[PDB]
Design a protein around this nucleic acid. Structure first.
Ligand SMILES: [Mg+2]
Ligand SMILES: [Mg+2]
Ligand SMILES: [Mg+2]
Ligand SMILES: [Mg+2]
Ligand SMILES: [Mg+2]
Ligand SMILES: [Mg+2]
Lengths: 140, 252, 119
RNA sequence: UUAUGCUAUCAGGUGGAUGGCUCGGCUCAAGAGCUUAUGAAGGACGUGCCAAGCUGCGAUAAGCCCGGGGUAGGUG
RNA sequence: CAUCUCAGUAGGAGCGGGAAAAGAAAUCAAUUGAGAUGCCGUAAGUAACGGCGAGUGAAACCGGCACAGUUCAAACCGAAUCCCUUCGGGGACAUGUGGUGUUGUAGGGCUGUUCAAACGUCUGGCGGUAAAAUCGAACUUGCCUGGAACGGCAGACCAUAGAGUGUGACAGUCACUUAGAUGUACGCCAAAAGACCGGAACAUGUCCCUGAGUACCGUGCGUUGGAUAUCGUGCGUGAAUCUGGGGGGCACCAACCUCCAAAACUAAAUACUCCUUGAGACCGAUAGCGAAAUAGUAGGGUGACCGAACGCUGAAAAGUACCCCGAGAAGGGAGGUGCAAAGUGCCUGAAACCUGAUAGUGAUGGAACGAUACGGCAUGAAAGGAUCUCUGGCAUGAAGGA
RNA sequence: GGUGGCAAUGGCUAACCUUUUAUCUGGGCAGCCGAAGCGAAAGCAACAUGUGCGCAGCCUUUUGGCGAGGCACGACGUAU
C-alpha cells in the first residue's frame, strides 16, 4: 500500500489497532474453513467439494485442430499467394495436412470452388462445400 | 530526405537523400520508457549480510522484573535481536535476490529509437536542450571522416564545421559533484556534447575518443541512452555516407 | 603501475598508504631543470641527498640549497635555508614535499645513478 | 539591595548530538583451488638496548644463506 | 486433531576432490520413429496422491550448453606372461599369467577368401602463456586575493593519454599513473616431423560360448505423484539359456514393435567460496561484520557457552621560552608560537543539567502554565513599512438608523 | 485500474548465441495466451446478420427521417 499516504495515521487504514494481528483476522491460512464458516465464499469462488467423472490417459486421447469453411474460403487467395494452395484449372486445391488442421467444420458461406483434402468432415461442411460445386477428398 | 554534405574543409560537395528513419514523429513517453528500462537493467544487487543483527541467544525476562518485555542477554540486561534495540536487525532491508530488471517489447523499443533518431533533425529540440551550434541540421560528412587518426585533425574538422564551442562548453562545465557520491567513485558531473556515428569500425573511434563530451559509436551500437541522455532527445550528432547507407531499414 | 581498474579512491589510498618500501622511492620524484631534461631525456627525476633544489611553492618561493636528508616513510625532504624557529629560539629544518621543488644540480656519486634515472 | 523564588535571553562549565572526512564493512562478477609421519592446522613458553600488548620469528629466535629486480638510505 | 503437513527438513555417523555423482539401453515411443550421461528452458501447478479436506506433485516429446567411446568373464591356443633385484638371482602362476573377444533387423570362436592398417601411446620442442619489473606526451607562465594557488583575470601547449589518487584550497600539462608498448628465471601448453600395438568386410553350421540364491514371485514395513500400475529390503520360495530371455503403467492368451540385465571404466557443459582481482542508485562510526581490529578482546559462566566501548591537533610540533605566586614535575598569572588555540581522548561543539548577569515581577496570595482584546515597563542596528505610524478636515456611503 | 506498442496475414518470446565486461545491437517459433463450444466419457460441431425499439451524430419543413455502439427477439451447436 501507499506507505507515504499513512505517515501520521497510526492505524494505517485498518481500523482499530486490534486488527491485523495474524492468521485469526483472516479466518485461517490458505483456503481454510472449507464448509464451516467460509462455505458461501467457497461456493462462489469455484472451490466446491466433490469429485465428478473420470479421465482417460493422455497416451490415447487427442485434441483435433479445427478450421471452418468460411475461414478457409475467405483466405484462399492469400493461401495460393503463399504457395500453400494450388490453382489448377481455376478450382483451388487446398490440402489441410500441410497447414496442420485435422478437421473441417461448416460455419460460414462458401462461394469459390474448393477441392479440400483432409481427414475429417462434419456433415454440414461437406454439404456446404459440394453445394458450391467443389469436391472433398478424405485424405489418407 | 536531402541534406548538404560537408567535407573536412567545410565545403558542400554533394546532396544525399536520407533514408526513411529520419522521417518520424516525436514521442517523449516511448523514449522515456526505453531509457529507464536500460538504466534499470544496468543495476547491480546489494544488501546486508544473511544473519546480520540476529546471531544471538537472547531471552526475555518475562513479567515481574519491572522492565520491558524485549529479549535481553543471558548474562546481562542489554536488549538485542529486535529492530528497535541497538545492534539489532533491520526491519525490511534490501535483499540481493530482488530482481529490478525491466522489460520493453522489441517493437516499441525500435519505435522509440527511431523517434529519437528523427529528433536530431529538428533545430529547436537540439537548441533548447542545451547545446550550442552554428550548422545546418542534420550534419552529414563524407566517408573520409573514418580515416582521421589524430585528435588534432578531429579538432580541426569540428572547428571548421561549427561544433567546437559545444566541446569547449563540455570541457569547462566539468565540476565537482555534491554529496556522498564523491567518496564512491563519482567525483565529477560531466556534460554531453556531440555524438559521431560511423558505419564500421575504423580509426576514428580511437581518435575522437579523448575529446571532452564526445562519444563515438558505430551504427550497430546505437541505443536510447546515447540519443536521449536523461530522457531528453535533441543530442548533437554527426553522420557519414556509410552510416546513412546502413539505415535504410535499420530499425524498422 | 596500477591500471584503470583502480578508479576507486579506497584502492588508490590503500596502495599509497601500505606500500612496499621499494615503491616509496618512486614517490621522491621532482621535476628537472631545462638543461637536465634536455641532456638526460627524462622529464623528471628522483631527489637524493646532496643535490641543489629550487623551492617553487609555499613560503620559500625561490630559495635554493642542498637536500640535507630524505625519509622514505614520511615522504618529505629537508632543505638548506628552509627552517622554523622554536619558542625559545632554535632554528629547525622544516620538511617539504619533493613535488614542490626543482632539481638544478644532480649529485653523481653512486655510479649507478645515471642508469637509475633512466632505463 | 525584596529574602527564598517564577518567566525569557546572554556568558561560562559539563556533555558529546549535528555537519564534513574515512587505510573499514557488505553484495555481485571474473579467476584459482587441496595440504600433512621429510611431522600439518592449532596451542603453550620464549625472543627486542631501553619492550607491557599485538604482529613476526624459534636457543642461528621482529631473524641466517643464494639468484634476480631496485637504488640511497634502514632499524614492524 | 490422529492419516496428511512441517519434511527426508533441523540434527547425527561414515567417506572424499578441486570438483564430485552419473554415463554408453534387457531405454523411450506408437502404429512406420529416436539413439550414452549431466545441466538450463518448457511441458505444469497438468497427470497422479489425499479425513478426495488442507495440501503434495512429476516424467517423456521439443529447444539449447557441451560432445567420446570402450574394457573384462567364456568359447580357441596352454606359460608363449607379470613384478623385485646387489643383475648373480628371487617371487607370482596349470585352483590359469598372456594372446584372440566383447554383441541383438544377434555377436564371437572353429573352417575358407579379400582389403590392409582407423583411433590411441611415446620422442620432438616451431611457437604461445609467462615474477618482481622497464618506458610512457604537454606550464609549475604573468597580475589579484590569500598563511599557502590546483582559484579569478590574461597567455602557451598535449591527447591511441580529459580513468583516478597525492601535493599548504577546485590539477590533462607538479608527482604516481592512464592510453600504448617492451622484459622476464622456474614452470605449463603445443604445431611440423619420427617410432610404436593394430584394423575393416565376405562365405559356410544336430558345431561350441555369451555374468544365479540372480531375474521373477508370495508376504510385512518405509518411501514415492506412482494410483490392483514408484523405488528400497526383512523373511520365505525360486528359472531358462538362442529352437533362448526381458519390456510395451490390473492378470492371462494371441498379433505386432523394441531391446540383451544380474561385471568395469570414462573427459566437457554444472555446484561452491578460505583465497586473488574488479565493480557498486550499497553503509558512513548507536550505521556497516560481534570487531575502522593491543576484537572473539576486556568481561561473564564449574562447563557447554554468552560477549562489549573506544576514529579526527596543525600546512609545518613551530607541543608554550623567560618572570611572579605556590610545599610542588600540581595549578594560576603575565608573556609568547601559529591565518586561526585547534593546548594533547586537542575538527565543529546542540539539548537536558549547573554557575553568574541582564529585563519584567515579587513576602494579602489560587492553579493545565495558554488563545483573543486593551494597558504598564524594557527593547525595536541588519534582514520589515515612509500617502507608512499618529492626529484631524472633506466627498460617496451597504445592512441598520436615532 | 491509468498510460502505451502491435493486432486474426494475432501478441510475446524462454534458455542460449553474438557481449567487444554484467549495459547494448541482431538472432532464438521450443513454448504460452487468443482463434469453438458442449459433455463424466466415447463423440459430435454453430448466425462473417433474419426482425424490432432507439442514444449520440448527420439531414430536415425544428417535426420527422437515417441510425455505428446498446437493448429485446428469432434461428442454430451440444448435454440431459
Ligand atoms: Mg550490526
Ligand atoms: Mg581425511
Ligand atoms: Mg557407473
Ligand atoms: Mg513430500
Ligand atoms: Mg591522465
Ligand atoms: Mg559498531
Amino acid at each position: 500500500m501507499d506507505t507515504k499516504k499513512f505517515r501520521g495515521s497510526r492505524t494505517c487504514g485498518g481500523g482499530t489497532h486490534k486488527n491485523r494481528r495474524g492468521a485469526g483476522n483472516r479466518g485461517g491460512r490458505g483456503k481454510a474453513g472449507g464448509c464451516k464458516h467460509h462455505f458461501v465464499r467457497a461456493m462462489m469462488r469455484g472451490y466446491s467439494y466433490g469429485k465428478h467423472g473420470f479421465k482417460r490417459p493422455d497416451e490415447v486421447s487427442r485434441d483435433v485442430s479445427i478450421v471452418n469453411v468460411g475461414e478457409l474460403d475467405e483466405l484462399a487467395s492469400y493461401l495460393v499467394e503463399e504457395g500453400l494452395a494450388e490453382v489448377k484449372d481455376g478450382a483451388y486445391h487446398i490440402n489441410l495436412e500441410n497447414l496442420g488442421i485435422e478437421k473441417v467444420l461448416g460455419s460460414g458461406r462458401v462461394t469459390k470452388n474448393l477441392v479440400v483434402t483432409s481427414e475429417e468432415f462434419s456433415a454440414s461442411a461437406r454439404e456446404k462445400i459440394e453445394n458450391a460445386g467443389g469436391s472433398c477428398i478424405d485424405a489418407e | 530526405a536531402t541534406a548538404k554534405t560537408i567535407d573536412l574543409t567545410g565545403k558542400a560537395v554533394g546532396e544525399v537523400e536520407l533514408p526513411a528513419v529520419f522521417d518520424a514523429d516525436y514521442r517523449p513517453d516511448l523514449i522515456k520508457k526505453a531509457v529507464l528500462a536500460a538504466q534499470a537493467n544496468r543495476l547491480q544487487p546489494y544488501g546486508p549480510r544473511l544473519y546480520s543483527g540476529m546471531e544471538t541467544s537472547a531471552r526475555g525476562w518475562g513479567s515481574g522484573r519491572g522492565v520491558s518485555h524485549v529479549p535481553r542477554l543471558v548474562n546481562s540486561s542489554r536488549a538485542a535481536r529486535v529492530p528497535h534495540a541497538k545492534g539489532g536487525r533491520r526491519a525490511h532491508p534490501p535483499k540481493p535476490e530482488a530482481d529490478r530488471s525491466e522489460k520493453v517489447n522489441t517493437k516499441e523499443r525500435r519505435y522509440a529509437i527511431r523517434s529519437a533518431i528523427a529528433a536530431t533533425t529538428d533545430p529547436t529540440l537540439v537548441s533548447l536542450r542545451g547545446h550550442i551550434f552554428e550548422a545546418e541540421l542534420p550534419i552529414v560528412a563524407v566517408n573520409d571522416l573514418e580515416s582521421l587518426e589524430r585528435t588534432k585533425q578531429v579538432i580541426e574538422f569540428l572547428e571548421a564545421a561549427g561544433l567546437y564551442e559545444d566541446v569547449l562548453r563540455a570541457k569547462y562545465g566539468r565540476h565537482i559533484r555534491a554529496g556522498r557520491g564523491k567518496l564512491r567513485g563519482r567525483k565529477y558531473k560531466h556534460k554531453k556534447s556531440v555524438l559521431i556515428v560511423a558505419g564500421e569500425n575504423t580509426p576514428i573511434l580511437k581518435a575522437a575518443r579523448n575529446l571532452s563530451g564526445v562519444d563515438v559509436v558505430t551504427v550497430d551500437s546505437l541505443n536510447a541512452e546515447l540519443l536521449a541522455p536523461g530522457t531528453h532527445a535533441g543530442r548533437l550528432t554527426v553522420w557519414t555516407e556509410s552510416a546513412i547507407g546502413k539505415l535504410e531499414g535499420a530499425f524498422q | 603501475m596500477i591500471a584503470m581498474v583502480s578508479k576507486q579512491p579506497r584502492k588508490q589510498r590503500k596502495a599509497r598508504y601500505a606500500a612496499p618500501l621499494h615503491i616509496r622511492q618512486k614517490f621522491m620524484g621532482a621535476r628537472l631543470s631545462e638543461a637536465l631534461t634536455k641532456e638526460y631525456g627524462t622529464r623528471s627525476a628522483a631527489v637524493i641527498t646532496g643535490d641543489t633544489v629550487k623551492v617553487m611553492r609555499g613560503d620559500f618561493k625561490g630559495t635554493e640549497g642542498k637536500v640535507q636528508s630524505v625519509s622514505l616513510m614520511d615522504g618529505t625532504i629537508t632543505v638548506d635555508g628552509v627552517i622554523s624557529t622554536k619558542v625559545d629560539g632554535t632554528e629547525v629544518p622544516r620538511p617539504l614535499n619533493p613535488s614542490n621543488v626543482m632539481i638544478t644540480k644532480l649529485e653523481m656519486k653512486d655510479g649507478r645513478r645515471a642508469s637509475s634515472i633512466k632505463k
